[PDB]
Design a protein around this ligand. Structure first.
Ligand SMILES: O=C(NCCCCCCNc1c2c(nc3ccccc13)CCCC2)c1cccnc1
Ligand SMILES: O=C(NCCCCCCNc1c2c(nc3ccccc13)CCCC2)c1cccnc1
Ligand SMILES: *[C@@H]1O[C@H](CO)[C@@H](O[C@@H]2O[C@H](CO)[C@@H](O)[C@H](O)[C@H]2NC(C)=O)[C@H](O)[C@H]1NC(C)=O
Ligand SMILES: *[C@@H]1O[C@H](CO)[C@@H](O[C@@H]2O[C@H](CO)[C@@H](O)[C@H](O)[C@H]2NC(C)=O)[C@H](O)[C@H]1NC(C)=O
Ligand SMILES: *[C@@H]1O[C@H](CO)[C@@H](O)[C@H](O)[C@H]1NC(C)=O
Ligand SMILES: *[C@@H]1O[C@H](CO)[C@@H](O)[C@H](O)[C@H]1NC(C)=O
Lengths: 534, 534
């Protein structure tokens, strides 16, 4: 050994950089490779492990982001623009980032972040995913992995071994492997690794909890606004086949064999794949993505619901939750009548339209039930109600009810569940009032940005961020977000019988029960039963 | 002419009796025949008109009640016992009763009452149907007809002319004919006849509004807690056939022809028919009756819904409404978990049971939708909620939503609609708190019993009765329950656009809109659509 910023791993040596944080400093190691570049012929394949290197890998700057579609709806607007790649995209994007306390701990708690973005987008290197605040403030080692999104990560021709499906998940698995293997050298305790993530990252987390090949490589888990059974999170192998074929068909490929097709898709430049990515969708829809995990028989041995039922999953502690207004962002981008700069009150006819796109797989009787459950018939041309009703349809259907079924099935077999409902709307939020508490807007609180005065949060917003960070980290370190025998208010355990949960906001903690049961009984029991019979 | 109590009609002379009322007196003519006894061979046939008589028919005492099943669930208990025949039953029961002001008016407004009782029971002669208070207080001529209930009134073998169906309705028609023809001699104005009725009588009223052969014989109409499209009010000709056959089968009849069967059913004593009346029902159910009107092609030319749609009905003014807790009486008598002497809180499993019996014609997905619409899933073992939820299911499904669809269809084509929601619970009510405001308990207020001090109502209950009687009679006399240019609060007209209605109770009038729309959209639009597809 020689110095604080030089760490030797099983893959080689690695030189970090000293990084400032809230009038102190910590070490940071950025863009460490954990896989061979999945380039040329390796596109669509499994990740291979990174060949070890001689010399000193310079880990002082963030790596390239994976190739992905780029938001251009509000150019220069920070609200949308903060989610885009802030680094040059490249297929050579399988790297991770480590923030580490100064001085180097010996065996501290590890937290590994898994970004969202519908499995079609996402970056480890964004500002909101910066781990220096969490690492500093809570004394954890913070890791952010990456994984291939889009067709590059999720094109599935089941049966073929060139493009099996799921490889973006295997990407994440392998970075977890790499942490299990090397994190001790950074002072991490590999027996005490929490994976955590939001959206597609929250569903990923749950996917690793479900998948055998992934369960041994982490200790605990946090799922934010996503769960592995969301209707957008996975597709049958038949559906993925259809879609890969349809992709080939948009690029004038030979389709008569897996071999010809893959060969063709591999001839292509990345942006050509992205240019037609969205055209493979079976339905006109929102909150649906083209290349997602497949239920293959390997990564997932059986269907998800049967795995949840039969207890076939890792049994450990989990902490998860949702945000008040999960759906708003989807309707803004994808639904008639919603604009960023307007109150977006919605005609009844735009309502009808919205429902159709929000529950794409529904026959007419379906749409009638969904519409009936969500319409105050005493006051049905209220455009605020129509607006807000549809907001809720999207979030209930896509995020909250799937998470709530996940929770109920998991807690039968598990060892501890802590549920939250995050409903603070930030004082500095650039988006309009109507979108409420938006998909992804608990993140900044999880990653500590309210402590950075220049980002202009309130003090009570700072205080909520420190509270949340300490819930998240205490939980990662112990299986419980509460600190033993302390005067603070207690986040009760969530149990099959009483179903408790807490709001997360600036007001004194309040405990509640049965998070959106009424609606989620509609989405999780009745609707599905109705579409099965008809 | 000779005296106040001797009236000469087209059928003969008739001697009334002078009857006391609230420290005054009026004339009354009871048990005047309007049809030949439908006895022996005439059983199940059309009514023939009464052969005129010589001499002076003694109209001083009530007639016989029609043959009918008799309530014995609470023997001696006045609550149930006040609905039973208070006169000897006989098949020779086609008579009417007339209360007339003293002195005899020359051309006053006429009101003709049509009793309820599921078309299986009812009497013109009950205490609550006594017209002397209404006649005296409001200066109307009050008529009460009767009609055959049970198989005697409603056995249907469509195609046959011995037992066509519907004859109990023709009974009522004929008493209306008789009023059109003779009421002038009692000082009634035959151009100004309101028919009115409750339950099966309310549905009858609407049935005469719908039926061509009946529409010319009245001016206006009031429907209390019933409407002609209630699901218990009518059956197909196939269903009525099945049921008449099944009746024969319970009495060991020959079933190979209409002729043999009818011959057989006519051999029988009345009580034999009543003894097995209830065994013909297709389903285990509540709020369902064995012999009811059939949709025959004659009395009703086409199906009810098509008649309502196409405007094929009498266009005049109507005044109608419902009571807060229509269903309670049905669940008391017919549903597990409900007792007269208990708070009747209901297990969830008794709930399930209740729903099954309340919506008999529902497949499992039906029962799931009904259960979902009516269960607070935040608090689902609340036995008061389960009790009250099912109360509402019965009243919504059977009384309120059918009336609300009737109203909406009628008001497109009609000339004035006045809707009420009667929700006063009487201070002297003998039934328990939980049954709330019960099916048939607006009647006593319509017939003025609160003015009779010895019945122990409050003064504000007296005042509500006088108010209601004057709404009912002003409406019969004018087409509007409101008196021109008067300081009183105004019962607004009910219109397609704004759907207004008033509560009827002791508190100052309150106007509302859209009576149980949310539920009735479930019952009138969605549920039926759901059972049609599945
Ligand atoms: O560029 C276009 N569409 C881009 C669609 C990509 C959307 C990226 C999503 N990024 C977000 C993400 C999250 N929340 C958001 C909240 C508000 C806005 C964006 C959020 C949370 C999960 C990570 C991504 C386009 C298409 C057609 C016409 N005009 C623009
Ligand atoms: O006798 C039995 N059941 C009789 C069923 C007949 C029910 C007659 C209905 N009479 C009522 C009627 C109305 N409201 C009522 C409210 C409370 C109670 C009775 C009401 C209003 C419409 C006219 C009839 C019986 C059956 C089996 C076991 N125990 C008793
Ligand atoms: C999680 O699992 C642990 C052990 O697998 C549980 O701890 C045990 O609880 C049982 C039942 O009360 C006790 O008899 C044992 O003594 C406990 N073992 C240990 C080592 O403490 C624990 O209850 C589970 N926690 C939850 C929240 O389900
Ligand atoms: C009921 O019908 C009568 C006539 O059939 C309506 O009275 C007419 O209303 C029209 C339209 O406003 C006027 O132009 C006529 O002058 C009225 N005729 C008479 C004789 O007054 C009445 O509007 C209808 N009422 C309701 C409540 O629909
Ligand atoms: C590491 O690389 C960066 C970025 O290109 C550079 O600024 C820095 O000086 C480098 N340091 C070493 C030791 O290579
Ligand atoms: C009318 O009949 C009743 C009842 O049977 C009787 O009390 C009364 O005296 C009779 N009067 C006449 C005139 O027949």
């Amino acid at each position: 050994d020689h110095s604080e910023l030089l760490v030797n791993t099983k893959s080689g040596k690695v030189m970090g950089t000293r990084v400032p944080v809230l009038s102190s400093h910590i070490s940071a190691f950025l863009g460490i490779p954990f896989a061979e570049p999945p380039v040329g012929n390796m596109r669509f394949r499994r990740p291979e492990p990174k060949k070890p290197w001689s010399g000193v890998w310079n880990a002082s700057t963030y790596p390239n982001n994976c190739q992905q579609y780029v938001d251009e709806q509000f150019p220069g607007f920070s609200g949308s623009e903060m989610w885009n790649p802030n680094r040059e995209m490249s297929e050579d994007c399988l790297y991770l980032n480590i923030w580490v306390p100064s001085p180097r701990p010996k065996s501290t708690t590890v937290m590994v972040w898994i970004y969202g973005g519908g499995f079609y987008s996402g970056s480890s290197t964004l500002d909101v995913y910066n781990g220096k605040y969490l690492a500093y403030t809570e004394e954890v080692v913070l890791v952010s992995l990456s994984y291939r999104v889009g067709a590059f990560g999720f094109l599935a021709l089941h049966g073929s071994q060139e493009a099996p499906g799921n490889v973006g998940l295997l990407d994440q698995r392998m970075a977890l492997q790499w942490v299990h293997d090397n994190i001790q050298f950074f002072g991490g305790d590999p027996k005490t690794v929490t994976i955590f993530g939001e959206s597609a990252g929250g569903a990923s987390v749950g996917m690793h909890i479900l998948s055998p090949g992934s369960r041994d490589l982490f200790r605990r888990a946090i799922l934010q606004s996503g769960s592995p059974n969301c209707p957008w999170a996975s597709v049958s192998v038949a559906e993925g086949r259809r879609r890969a074929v349809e992709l080939g068909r948009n690029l004038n490929c030979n389709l008569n064999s897996d071999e010809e097709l893959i060969h063709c898709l591999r001839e292509k430049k990345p942006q050509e794949l992205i240019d037609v990515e969205w055209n493979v969708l079976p339905f006109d829809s929102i909150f649906r993505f083209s290349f997602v995990p497949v239920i293959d028989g390997e990564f997932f041995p059986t269907s998800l619901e049967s795995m949840l039922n039969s207890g076939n999953f890792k049994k450990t502690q989990i902490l998860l939750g949702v945000n008040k207004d999960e759906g708003s962002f989807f309707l803004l981008y994808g639904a008639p009548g919603f604009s960023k700069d307007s109150e977006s009150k919605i005609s009844r006819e735009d309502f009808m339209s919205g429902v159709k796109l929000s529950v794409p797989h529904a026959n007419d009787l379906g749409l009638d039930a969904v519409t009936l459950q969500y319409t105050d018939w005493m006051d049905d041309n209220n455009g605020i109600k129509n607006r807000d009703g549809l907001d809720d349809i999207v979030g209930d259907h896509n995020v909250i009810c799937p998470l709530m079924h996940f929770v109920n099935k998991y807690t039968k077999f598990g060892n501890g569940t802590y549920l939250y409902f995050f409903n603070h709307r930030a004082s500095n939020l650039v988006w309009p009032e109507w979108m409420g508490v938006i998909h992804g807007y608990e993140i900044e609180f999880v990653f500590g940005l309210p402590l950075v005065k220049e980002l202009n949060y309130t003090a009570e917003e700072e205080a909520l961020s420190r509270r949340i960070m300490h819930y998240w980290a205490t939980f990662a370190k112990t299986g419980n977000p509460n600190e033993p025998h302390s005067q603070e208010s207690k986040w009760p355990l969530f149990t099959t019988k009483e179903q408790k949960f807490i709001d997360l906001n600036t007001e004194p903690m309040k405990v509640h029960q049965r998070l959106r049961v009424q609606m989620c009984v509609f989405w999780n029991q009745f609707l599905p039963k109705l579409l099965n019979a008809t």
